[PDB]
Amino acid sequence: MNVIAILNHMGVYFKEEPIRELHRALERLNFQIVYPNDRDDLLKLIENNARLCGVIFDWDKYNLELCEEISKMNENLPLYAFANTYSTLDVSLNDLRLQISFFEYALGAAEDIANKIKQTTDEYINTILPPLTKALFKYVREGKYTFCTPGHMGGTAFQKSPVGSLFYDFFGPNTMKSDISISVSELGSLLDHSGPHKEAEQYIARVFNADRSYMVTNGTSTANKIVGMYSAPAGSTILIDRNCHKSLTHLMMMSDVTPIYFRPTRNAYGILGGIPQSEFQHATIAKRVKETPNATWPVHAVITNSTYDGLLYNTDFIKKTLDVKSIHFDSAWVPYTNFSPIYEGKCGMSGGRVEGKVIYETQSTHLLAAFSQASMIHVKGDVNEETFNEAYMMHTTTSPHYGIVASTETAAAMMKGNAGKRLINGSIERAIKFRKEIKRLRTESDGWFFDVWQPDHIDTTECWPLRSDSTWHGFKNIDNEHMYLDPIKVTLLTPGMEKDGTMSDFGIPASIVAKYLDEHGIVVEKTGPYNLLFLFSIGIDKTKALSLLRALTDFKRAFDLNLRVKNMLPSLYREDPEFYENMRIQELAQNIHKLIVHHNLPDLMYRAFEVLPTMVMTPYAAFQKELHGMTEEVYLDEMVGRINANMILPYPPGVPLVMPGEMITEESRPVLEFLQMLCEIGAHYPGFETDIHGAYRQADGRYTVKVLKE
Amino acid sequence: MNVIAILNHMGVYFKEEPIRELHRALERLNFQIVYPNDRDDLLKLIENNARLCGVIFDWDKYNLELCEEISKMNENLPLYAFANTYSTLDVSLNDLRLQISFFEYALGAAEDIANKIKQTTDEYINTILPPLTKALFKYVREGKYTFCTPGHMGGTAFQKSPVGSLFYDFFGPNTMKSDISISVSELGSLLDHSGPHKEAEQYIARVFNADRSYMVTNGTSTANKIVGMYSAPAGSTILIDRNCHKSLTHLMMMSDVTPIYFRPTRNAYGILGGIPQSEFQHATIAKRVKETPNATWPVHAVITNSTYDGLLYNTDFIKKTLDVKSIHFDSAWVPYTNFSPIYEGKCGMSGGRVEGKVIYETQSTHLLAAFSQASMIHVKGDVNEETFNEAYMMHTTTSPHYGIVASTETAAAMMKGNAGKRLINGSIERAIKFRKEIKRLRTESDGWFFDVWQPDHIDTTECWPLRSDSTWHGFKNIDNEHMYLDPIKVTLLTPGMEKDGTMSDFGIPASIVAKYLDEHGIVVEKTGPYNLLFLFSIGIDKTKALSLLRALTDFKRAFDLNLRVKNMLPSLYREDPEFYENMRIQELAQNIHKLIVHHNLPDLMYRAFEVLPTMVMTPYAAFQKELHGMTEEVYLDEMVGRINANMILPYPPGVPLVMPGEMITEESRPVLEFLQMLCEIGAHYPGFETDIHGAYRQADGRYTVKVLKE
Amino acid sequence: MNVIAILNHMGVYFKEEPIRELHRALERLNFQIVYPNDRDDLLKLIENNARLCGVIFDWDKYNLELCEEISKMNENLPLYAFANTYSTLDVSLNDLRLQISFFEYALGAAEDIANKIKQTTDEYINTILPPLTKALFKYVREGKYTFCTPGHMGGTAFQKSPVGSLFYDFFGPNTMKSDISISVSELGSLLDHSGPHKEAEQYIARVFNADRSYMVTNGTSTANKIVGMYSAPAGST
C-alpha cells in the first residue's frame, strides 16, 4: 500500500515548486506516486483501486466539488488538503464525518510531513485492522522467543530438506510464521474465549446481530453435532426437515432419537417448494405425533431457511406458529440477510428476541468469502452459556490452525460498514443486467434460445413474490405471500420441455452443456436433465459474465452447426474413439434425448420421489447391528422386502432415496425402478455412466448393496 | 534452488577457458555460482546447505577421493564430471547407486549443456516430489479454469478491500492459491481415497510399515472417536488406561460403555511407572471383570505406549499376554520408532501381524514436524475396510484445507530415506553431548548444580534399561527388562530434595526458573515443583543449546547474587509493586520454599493421587441428567458426599482428580485436602495463583463446582 | 512472434496509468510493443503483418466499429478488450465466432495477466499447428534420448570437422535436429500410416475433398509408377 495520487498543474510556480519538492521527497521516502488523468478518473481510481491510499489536492480547487463525493466512497481515506488564506469551513460540512489532515505549502516540512503521512497511514491501518490479527501480525514482525514449540520454529524444520524447502518457498514465510500456538499468551485463547478472543466474539456478535457467536473451524458439520448432543437427549422427539445433510444422519446414528419429518412440496419442474403452513400448525403436528410410536411433543426442530431456490419464510410466522421451544434455522444459504433491507422479516436473526424460544442459525460462511470448513453458530436466546462450552470443548480439536481462524475473522472485517454494503449491491446490479441481456437475446436470436425462469417484470429491486394466481413459476397450489425469488440465484433452462411440463420434440440435455463448459474450464454448481445453476457472487466480475455470456452463445452456435464430437469434445472422444469417431454433436444430443423420451425418464423421476420408503427400524438400531457384523451384501434387484443397511444416495437428483432401516415395497416400487432404470440407461454411452453412492457396480452392470442379516 | 558450486583452478588454460565460457553462460542462464574453499568445505557445504544442488569437478582430480563420500551424503545429488581420455570406471564402483551425467570440456555446448542441467534438475525434482503435491503445484503454476468456485478465486475477493489486501499480502499468493476444492478432478479425492490419493496412502503405509493408513486433519482427538464409535458398541466393556485424554471423556459421555482401568504405578519422585505385568495377566483382569457390575470380557483395550518418561513396553509381551482381540496403542509419544534399530521389539508396528488381533497406533504427528491437528491412524490387522470408511465419512469435515493435508504429507517426504535417518541421529548426538556437559559443570561448578536423572554410564547408544537392582531411577519394586530411558527426553532436576525423596534445607522451586525463562522467551514443556522438561527435537540446534546452557548457568549465577525481583523480573514486579519493591530473588525463593515445607506440600500431593475417588454413576448417566438441567452449583468445600457434575482438573499435576459421577468420601479426603490446600497456599503471592479448570474462584478465594441435583 | 500493438491516448489518467503499468510489465516480460498510427493503420498492419499477434483496445471506443472488421481478417487473433461498467454484448454479435479474453484496468494483475497472455498465445499456437509437427517441435525442444541412432546425433558428427562446422552453422541447428527417424515412436509411422500420421492423412483428405490421400516424397514421377504397376498389368491396353 504505497501508491499516492496527485491530482494537478495549478499554473503558478509559487504552488508548484513546493509540490515538486514534496514529490521528490516522497519518492525518496519510498512512496510510488500515481497521477489520475483528471477529477473523473480519480473518483474511478478510488472506486476501482484499493492500493490507492491517499489524495493530495488544492482545497479551494476541489472541496465544494469533492467532499461529499469522496465521503460516500470511503470516510477514512487520507486527504492531504493544501489551504489558501481565505479557505474556511462552510456550515454544510457539519454532518459529514471526515478524517482530514491540513497542510501548508512550505519548504522545510518535507521530512516532517512525510513522516506524518507515513505515521498517519500506520495510525489508520490500526483503526481498520481487528485487534487479535493486529497483535499476531505485529508478533510475526517483531517477536523473538526461543526455547519454544512448535519444533519447526517458523518453518525452520522444512529448510533442512530440499523437498521441504520447495514447499516452504512455494507457500512463503507468512504462511509458515503465522502457524502459531497458545504460547503467544497475549492473544488470549480461543478455547477459553479470553482477552482479544473475547473482543473478537463481541465484534462478530455486534455486526451479525447475534446475542452470542462461536467460531468453528471444522464446518457446520461440527456445529450441528455440538448443538445436537447438547440439545437432543436420547429418547427425545425432534422435528427434522426431510431435506437433511449427511452430518445429521451421522448424528442420528449416534443418538437414540425419534424423528418426525417436515415434508417439502414440489412442482412439475421438480423445484422444491416450502414446507406448507399446514406442517407448522398444531393440528398437523399433533396428528404426526399421534401416529408416531414413542413420540412425545417435539423438544427441538431444524428448518432450512431459505429454501434452495430462494423461497424465504415469513420468519415472523414461523417463530409465532411453531410451538417448539428450540428452533434451529440451518441458514447455510442466506448468510447475508442482515445486510440488505429487502430481507427484513425474512431471516432468522431479523428483529429482536423470540419470547420463550431459543433460535439458532448455523451458517456455512464458506455464499460469503472464507476458507472451507469455516462455520458460525449464532444464538438468539438463552442457554446455559458456560455448559454449552463444555459440550463445545469436548468436540473441538486441540490443533487449531490460526490461519483458518484469521481467514474467517478477516472475511468479516471485509464486509464491515458501507463499502461492504455497496459490494453486494454491485453483484445485484450485474445479475439484473445479465437477466435483461438474456431476455433481449431470446427475442433477437435465431429460433430457440435459453430462457430465464422469472416473472415478466423485474425492473424493480426486491425479492419477487410468488403467488397462487401466477403461472410463471409452474408450482401447483402455492401458498401466497410465502416464497420470493432471490435475484442472485439464477436458474437457466435448456430446451426440452413445454410450458405444460410435458416433453418437447426438440431437446438438448443439460449434461452436454456441462461437458462443453468443462472443456472451457467453467464450473457448474448443479445440473439436472434440463437445468443449470449459476451463482452471481461477489467473485463474478464483468469479465467472467462476458466470457460466460459468449460461451453460452458459442455452445448454441456450435451445436447448430453440428460439429464433430471428435472436434468439439476431444477428451470425450478419447474415451471411446470408435463409438465417437464420426458422430456429430447433434446426433449425440438426439440419441440421448430420444433415450430419455423412450425410457420415460422425466415421468419416472418425478414419481420416484413422490412417495417414501417405509421405516422399519432407525438408522441407529441398524448401525448397532452393523457394529456386530450383522450385515450381508445382496444385489440391488434383491432388496425389496429386506432391511437396508447403508444409505443409498443416487445422482440424480442428489438426495437420499433409502435410509439404513428402510425397506422398499410394491407400494413404493417406483423408487427401485428409477434406480434400476438409471443403471440400465447409463450403460450405453461412454462418459455418461450411472452414479450411486453406496452401490457397487459389477462387471455385468449389476449393483450390490448391504442389508441387515436375519 | 539455483546455487551451483565450482570446486577449481586446474593450472591449464585448455581446461580453464571452457570452464570460464561455462561460468559466464551459466550466470547468463540465471544460476548463482558458489565456490567452496576446498574439498573439505565442499563436503561441509553439502552437509549444511540444501540449496546447493550440483557439483562440477574434474573426474580424475576427485573421483577416487570423493565418490563414496558424496554417495553417503546424497545419492541423487547432481554431479557434473569433466572427463579425460584415460578416465574409466573401476570395478569398485559396482555396488554404488550413482546418478551421473558425463560432460566434455568443449566450446559450443554451453546453451545445450545449460538446458540439460536445467532440464535434469527439473527431472530430479520430479523424482523427489510426491505425486499429488506435484500435480497441485503444477496446477497452481499453469492452470486457468473459469466459472469456478470457491468464489474468491485464488484470493481475488480479498483484493477488493484494503484490510483483505493486507492479509493477502502478508501470507502471500501461494497460501491463497493452494486453497482448492475437489473441482481439481485430476487429484482424485481424499474422501473416496481415489487416484493420486490412493497412491499417497500406499506411499505412507509403505514407509510407516502399516497395512493401511488414514490421513486425519482434525487431530488424534477425531481419530479416537472414529475408532471408538466403530469399535465400542453400547453396553460393551473396554480396558482403558486411567491415564486418559479429555477426548476419551467426550467419547464416554457419548457412548454407554463400562470401563475397567489399567492402573499405572508411580515412584517417590512422582514419575509414572508402567502398568505392571500383573495388570495384563488373565488372573488380574478376571478379578476386575468379576468385581465390576455388568462387565463382560473386554472387547477393546487402549494402552499408551510408551509411557511419558520413556518406559517402552516389550510390545511382544503385550501382544502375546493381553487376551483382547482389539488393541489400540495411542502411540502419540513415539512416532519415530520405525526409524532407529534401537526400538526393535518396543513399538506397536514392529515386526509382522499379530495373529488373531487388530492392533492400532493413533499418532500425533504434530514429536515430528507437521501442522497442529495432523494425526494418523495406522492399522495392523483386518477390519471391514469399506465399512470403516462409512464411519470415517460420518465424522469427517466437508471443508478440507488442502494446505494442512500437504503439510502432513510433506512431513513424511522429509523423513524419507537415509538422510531422514541421519537427521534424527544428529539430535541424539547433541542430547548425549549436552548430557555430558551437565555432568562436567556439576563437578566444576561452585557448590550446588543441576543434575541429570540418568544412569552412571551413558557412553553407549541405547535406551538404557531400568532394573529393580538399580537405585538411580528412584522407583520402588520395578519390573525388570521392562522400562528404558529415551536419550532424547531430558528431565532436569532443580535443588530441593535429597536422595531419599525427603526435603532439603535448601530449595529452589522450579516455578521460579519458569518465570526467569519467560523473560528470556524460552518455552518450558512441563514444570513440577522441582522438575522441568526439555525436548531435544530436530528443531533444537547448537545455537539454542548454547543459549539454553548459558541461560541456565546465568539463572544460577543471578540467583546466587541475590538480585532484586524488581530488576530480574520486571513484569512480575508490575503485578504488585509494593509486595515486590525491595524483595530479592533469594527471599522470594526462601519464602515460597518455606511455605512448601510448612504446608507439607510434597507429602500431600503424593498421597492425593495414591487413592481413587468412588464412582457412583458413569459420566454418561450424569450428563443425561445435566442435559435436562439437573445440576446445581455448590462450593468446593461442600462436595464430599455429593455426586460431581463436572470433571475437576487441577494444575498441578495436570491430570483428572474427580470425574462426573464420582464422589469424594472420608476414605479419599486427601483428594479434597490437596485441592483446598492449593487454593489456600496460592493466595499469598501475586503471580503465583491457583489453577483449577471447572472451578470458579470467588472474591473471597472460595471455589464453586457443579453437582447433580437430587 | 512477440510484437504487441497498442492502439491509444484516452485522455484520462485513471485509464492511462494502468496501461503504463502494463506496457512496462510487458516489456519486462519480453514482449516488443508496437504502436499503429491509428485505427486505419492497425487494420493494414494486421492485413500486412503476420508477426503482429494481439491487439489491446478500449472496448467502447472500438468494438461497434471493429468487431466484424477484425473477424473478417482473422477469427482467432487475440483481442485484449478493456471494459467499462456499461459495456455489454449486443445481439448483433450472435453469429460471429470470437475468441475473446476480457480484462479490467487494475493494478496488481500485471504478472498474472502477462502470464495469461503468454499462456493464451501458446494455447492458440497449439490450435493452429498440426498434430505431428507439434510433437516433433516439442521433441526437439525438450527430448533427451541417449544410445540412439542416427550416429550423428543432432548433427554432432558435423562439429568434429571445420568444414562440417561451416555446413552445420550455415544451415543451423533446427535443420540438423529435425532430421530424425522412426525411433521417435510417439509420432507413429509414415509407412504404417499409424498414430499422428493417420490423423495427418485424415486432415489432408478432409481439406482436399479426397476419400484417401498419400504423402509421396519422391515427386509425382514416383506416384505415377506406384499407380501404374498396381493398375496396368502386362498385356493390357
Author numbering:
A (entry chain A), B (entry chain A): 1 to 366, 368 to 711
C (entry chain A): 1 to 237
The study reports:
extracellular pH, and works in conjunction with a cognate inner membrane antiporter. excreted by the antiporter in exchange for a new amino acid substrate. that it is a decamer made of two pentameric rings. central pore, with the CTDs at the periphery.
the LdcI at active pH (LdcIa, pH 6.2). 7.5 Å to 6.2 Å resolution. whole upon enzyme activation by pH and the binding of LARA. decameric state upon activation and incorporation into the LdcI-RavA cage.
